[PDB]
Amino acid sequence: STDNAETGVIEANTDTDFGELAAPGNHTNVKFLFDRSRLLNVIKVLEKDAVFPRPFPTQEGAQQDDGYFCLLTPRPTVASRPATRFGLYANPSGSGVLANTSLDFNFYSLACFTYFRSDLEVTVVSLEPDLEFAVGWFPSGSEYQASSFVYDQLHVPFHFTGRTPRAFASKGGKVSFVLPWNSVSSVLPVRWGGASKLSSATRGLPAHADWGTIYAFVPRPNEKKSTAVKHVAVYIRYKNARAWCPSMLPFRSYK
Amino acid sequence: RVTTQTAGNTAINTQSSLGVLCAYVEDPTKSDPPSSSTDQPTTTFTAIDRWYTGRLNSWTKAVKTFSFQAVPLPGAFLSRQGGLNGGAFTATLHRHFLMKCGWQVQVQCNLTQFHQGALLVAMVPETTLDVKPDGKAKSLQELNEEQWVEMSDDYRTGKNMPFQSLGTYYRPPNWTWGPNFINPYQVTVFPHQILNARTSTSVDINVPYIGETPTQSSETQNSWTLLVMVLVPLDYKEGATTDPEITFSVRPTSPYFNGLRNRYTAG
Amino acid sequence: GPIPTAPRENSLMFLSTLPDDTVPAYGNVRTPPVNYLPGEITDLLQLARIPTLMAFERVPDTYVPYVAVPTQFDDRPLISFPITLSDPVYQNTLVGAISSNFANYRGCIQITLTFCGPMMARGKFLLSYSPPNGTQPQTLSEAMQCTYSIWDIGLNSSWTFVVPYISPSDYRETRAITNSVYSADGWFSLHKLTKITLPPDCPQSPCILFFASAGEDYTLRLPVDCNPSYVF
Amino acid sequence: GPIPTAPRENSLMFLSTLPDDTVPAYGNVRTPPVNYLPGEITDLLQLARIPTLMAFERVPDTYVPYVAVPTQFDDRPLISFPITLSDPVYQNTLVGAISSNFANYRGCIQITLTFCGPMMARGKFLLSYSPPNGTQPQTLSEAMQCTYSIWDIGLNSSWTFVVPYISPSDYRETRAITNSVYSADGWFSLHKLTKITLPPDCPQSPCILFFASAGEDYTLRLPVDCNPSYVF
Amino acid sequence: GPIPTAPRENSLMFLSTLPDDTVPAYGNVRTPPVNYLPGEITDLLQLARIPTLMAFERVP
Amino acid sequence: RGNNGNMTFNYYANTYQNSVDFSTSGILNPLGYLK
Amino acid sequence: RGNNGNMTFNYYANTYQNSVDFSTSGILNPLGYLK
Amino acid sequence: RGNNGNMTFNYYANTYQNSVDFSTSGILNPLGYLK
């Protein structure tokens, strides 16, 4: 029919040309679609007080504990820090240390807007049989407390106690709870183009776009360290999500 | 199809026009002062309530499909790109810390009926194309040699945006993706108009203010970016006409300013 | 006193899509208002209703989104493609991208065209839509009998062709594997009825742009998992 | 009969901040009344609103809480400090100590001064507040353009300077690590506009005392863990 | 506060004919109507009331 | 109706418990009529 | 609203269940208006 | 009042839940008055 699509705003079934007005029969709603769990990352389990990674760039011969901790955000991250370029180690054995990375494939498969906001609901699942553990979390912009104290000649890491929530699960159990949107920024920028500092900043790297941080540890004294490593899984959900402006979608190769 | 819009002491004429695209909401002009500060703000006045004009590179047959050029806002004012000179607006910008404003632009071309081709212009929000992959803004001298940006798999995948080097402690990963890819086939989602060679000459858009905070820093914000891309390569009979030119006009709307101080300096 | 109870067979189970809440841990937190942000989204159909561009293989990357009219033809449509949403031509369109993440769809697809060439040219085109058959129709004589329409170059260079929805079932699958009647729904083709008259001094070979989107009665039902292939 | 039930996935869990009570073990106990004790506290902001003293490095412990005016000057403020609550100067003030245990703050800081010297002296001072910039302003000419005020020695020897709250976000972080725009908020400085006239027989070199506190619209949001460093 | 309770002797049991429902996992799904199909059955006695044939050994 | 005993309380909503068809807007009948 | 089935009883208070913004005191609109 | 979420039902009696003193029969006041 007559129209002018160069103007952009085109008009708007078969009743117009030849109709059929098939009756309705809301599964695409933003609030409904995003309410379901999905894996985020897999992390080790602590057995003593750890040293948080230093900010980049990290020089050779720097002592720290890497592989633990994990942010709560869909945007790409590296070494438990915000990042922009997603990457992976597809190459064979090399040298140095390998940096853990994460990303929300399912979220970005339909991330067709710019700004987002919702509540987060976290849960944790163990992997090794009959494993006992616990979880700890702190808000954005805070810091992880190091060092340990002595009780009856046993070194208890400080992270056993704090004003932030703690969770103890029975042998072979699971954890779950819901946290509030606590970042300073009003909404989460899916893609950004600003700078966080007046000088020496990196374009397009947001500062406090997340929900917090999480870690896992065993309720034992530091005098009972073991050798075999342990692992833990993490899942997240979104509650009352909202979107605020259109955007693009990931490109699909034509190979 | 003949209308003129008057603002301040300057006016613009349109021999052909379809209308004005109002973007997300009706009446983008309406706005309110921010809420993340207390000091009284500075508002609009006649000195800044007017248009501004600039120039772009020429269009040549050698250009292929999907090539593009970008003009960040308001960073164009600060960089003096394309000869644009904000004057009073730039002077006021350099003497403040917080800003909030809309935008309203129009682009014109001099295509004649004896030419075939198409152009697409849109206001892509929250993008970074000006910066080189190294992590430094493209200089005015560098922007001249290359008149149009060549589309490539790297840009399509967003694999070459600025990043932070890890350091000798780690091993270099293989970068393969980033959240600022460019998808040419879907650029029409943002407000746009098709500048065909046989239907019209001038296009225009009206956009409101957006951002993840009620106000953004006035020295680094890059909310809106003006993008022009070529769909159908230019072609014409030899000897008729050569390489038309391009121009554009800008005008802020209902701005606010906060945080007075001396002139900005770096180091 | 204690209330008698009997735990069921599915206690201590974890469901990834259970419609229920969880206990709060750090409640009683306020947040800044967001009434200043315009353009809130409510349903992805709003984005699905926006036109976008298609792709084509081009002669022997080469995936230009337009088709160029040749000079001499041979009893064959200029371009034709199936109506299966898993087809390559629908890959990057918003409708195809969104639908690929759902199982069932329902409604009328919408196709829009636009001409790009010299003003003083003329011509006439024919658009066709053939439901499923044993063999894809080729000749103009065959095409004419099925549903069709005639497009005439004039002041307005754009035209919209609405594909009717006919199928033996209320819903239809979104991706085709066996090409059963439940997924495939025929073909679409473009035929040059006349010969395009290029005015003097206008060089040659105009081009046509394809615009596709969803109709006003589109719908999707069942969510599914995604393909992370785009990360590699 | 028994009521069917289904325990959830998070049974037998212990939360250190769960908002719920526990079963009593030794209830039904009375206690003596406490209506005789005056001065009950309800909110720590009441204590946060009380002025206190600051610290300064002094010339080469040496952390006297006052600043002494020199005789000859050189185009530079007598004392300046950032507006980051993690700065050393804010360590022992009540506002700094309390805020260090919370994540986000909001409101206007308050600064108060007082003069200590001979009665029959005279002078004039200038106070400045510079939002974030590429370089900290130094000269009086620069300082004058920004927000400022002039203090005159007279019958009243005390003055209060209110630091306005301007930021791109509703809330701000309490401790700075990267010095991002979300934590740092500029600098404060003191400049001697004139030369202080010491009356005869009054020896020299008066002193100034710094008083800091919280404004009337201060606020803190998120509790956090503490630092036990004070025990060592 | 917590409500006291006492699980019975037959907890965590599975019955193949227990008259009770189960928690939904993928609810909120609509289906096409079936008002166009005639001849709905309600009780198998309707089919039981229909004559049929018998069998007999016949001579060897 | 059906092998369902509970007759006091349904926790989850009907739409989330059972499917519903979308609108398009003793005594036993015999399966054979002989005019 | 949302993928929530329970419609009979909410135990914890709304303020402790969901965040709330502090006061400062079918039919689908199109995202583009063309005057 | 306090970090308590439940607002529907208290099982045990108040006397057995919290201590009680036996009878002997926004707006914030300032802790200092200057006559």
Task: Say how far apart CA A106 and CA B13 lie, in whole Å.
Answer: 49
| Closest among B91, B169, B50, E31 to A25, alpha carbons compared | E31
Phi, psi of B59 (to 5 degrees): -110, 125
Tell how strand E30-31 and strand F20-21 pair up.
parallel
Q: Are there at least 3 beta-carbon pairs closer than 8 Å between F and H? A: no
Q: Cβ(D118)–Cβ(D202) under 8 Å?
A: yes
Q: Which residues contact B71 (CB under 8 A, 6 or more apart)?
A: B54, B56, B81, B82, B225, B226, B248
Q: Are there at least 3 beta-carbon pairs closer than 8 Å between H and G? A: yes
| Closest among G10, A34, C19 to E27, alpha carbons compared | C19
Which chain G residues have a beta carbon less than 8 Å from that of B22?
Answer: 32-35
User: Over H1-35, what HEC string results?
Assistant: CCCCCECCCCCCCHHHHCCEECCCCCCCCCCCCCC
Question: At residue B121, what is the residue type?
Answer: V
Tokens standing for residue A148: 């340990």
Task: Say how far apart CA B77 and CA B222 lie, in whole Å.
Answer: 12
Select the residue from A196, A251, A253 to test the B interface by mutation, using most B Cβ atoms within 10 A.
Answer: A251
| Contact status of E35 with chain A (Cβ, < 8 Å) | no
Task: Say how far apart CA C181 and CA C165 lie, in whole Å.
Answer: 13
| Closest among A84, A114, A109, A85 to A33, alpha carbons compared | A109
Task: Give the H/E segment covering residue A31.
Answer: helix A30-33
Question: At residue E59, what is the residue type?
Answer: V
Residues belonging to chain B = 267
Q: Other CB atoms closer than 10 Å to residue A248's CB: what's the count?
A: 25
Question: Which experimental technique did the depositors report for determining this structure?
Answer: cryo-EM
Give CA separation, G2 vs A161, A241, C20, C225, F17, in Å.
Answer: 36, 9, 10, 19, 15
C-alpha distance from D110 to closest chain B C-alpha (Å): 14
Tokens standing for residue D114: 């007082």
Q: Cβ(A52)–Cβ(A144) under 8 Å?
A: yes
**Long-range CB contact pairs, G12-15, < 8 A, 24+:** G12/C23, G12/C24, G12/C27, G12/D19, G12/H5, G12/H6, G12/H7, G13/H5, G13/H7, G15/C27, G15/C28
Which chain D residues have a beta carbon less than 8 Å from that of H22?
Answer: 30-33
Q: What angle do CA G14, G17, G18 make, to 5 degrees?
A: 85
Q: Indicate the residue of A165, A173, A196 with minimum beta-carbon distance to D17.
A: A165
Give the burial class of D132: count Cβ atoms within 10 A of its Cβ; 0-12 exposed, 13-18 middle, 19 or more buried: buried
Task: Say how far apart CA B43 and CA B101 lie, in whole Å.
Answer: 10
Strand partners, C126: C150, C191
Give CA separation, G34 vs A105, B21, C53, F12, in Å.
Answer: 37, 5, 22, 46
| Closest among B61, B88, B82 to B248, alpha carbons compared | B82
Task: Say how far apart CA B66 and CA B150 lie, in whole Å.
Answer: 8
CA atoms within a 13 Å half-sphere pointing along the CA-CB vector of C146: 22
Task: Say how far apart CA A68 and CA A146 lie, in whole Å.
Answer: 14
Give CA separation, D56 vs B55, C134, E49, in Å.
Answer: 56, 92, 105
My answer on whether omega of the bond before A57 falls inside 30° of 0, hence cis, is: yes
Phi-psi region of A96 (alpha: psi -120 to 50; beta: other; left: phi over 0): left
Q: Cβ(B155)–Cβ(B133) under 8 Å?
A: no
Q: Cβ(A11)–Cβ(A182) under 8 Å?
A: no
CA atoms within a 13 Å half-sphere pointing along the CA-CB vector of A252: 22
Q: Are there at least 3 beta-carbon pairs closer than 8 Å between H and E? A: yes
Q: Cβ(B91)–Cβ(B173) under 8 Å?
A: no
Domains of chain D: residue spans and CATH: 1-232 (2.60.120.20)
Residue linked to tokens 């560098």: B142
Give CA separation, D19 vs C96, E1, G10, G20, in Å.
Answer: 47, 10, 15, 18
Task: Say how far apart CA D34 and CA D41 lie, in whole Å.
Answer: 14
User: Over A129-153, what HEC string results?
Assistant: CCCCCEEEEECCCCCCCCCEEEECC
Task: Say how far apart CA A214 and CA A159 lie, in whole Å.
Answer: 12
| Contact status of A207 with chain D (Cβ, < 8 Å) | yes
Which chain A residues have a beta carbon less than 8 Å from that of F24?
Answer: 23
Q: Which residues contact F32 (CB under 8 A, 6 or more apart)?
A: none
Q: Cβ(B169)–Cβ(A97) under 8 Å?
A: yes
Which chain H residues have a beta carbon less than 8 Å from that of E1?
Answer: 6, 10-12, 17
A25 and E30 within 8 Å at the Cβ level: the answer is yes
Contacts with A, B 27-56, CB within 8 Å: none
Task: Say how far apart CA C56 and CA C61 lie, in whole Å.
Answer: 11
The answer regarding whether domain A1-255 maps to CATH 2.60.120.20 reads yes
Task: Give the H/E segment covering residue C104.
Answer: strand C104-106
Q: Cβ(A148)–Cβ(A222) under 8 Å?
A: yes
Task: Give the H/E segment covering residue G14.
Answer: helix G14-17
Q: Which residues contact B167 (CB under 8 A, 6 or more apart)?
A: A56, A57, A58, A59, A60
* Three-state secondary-structure class, residue B174: strand
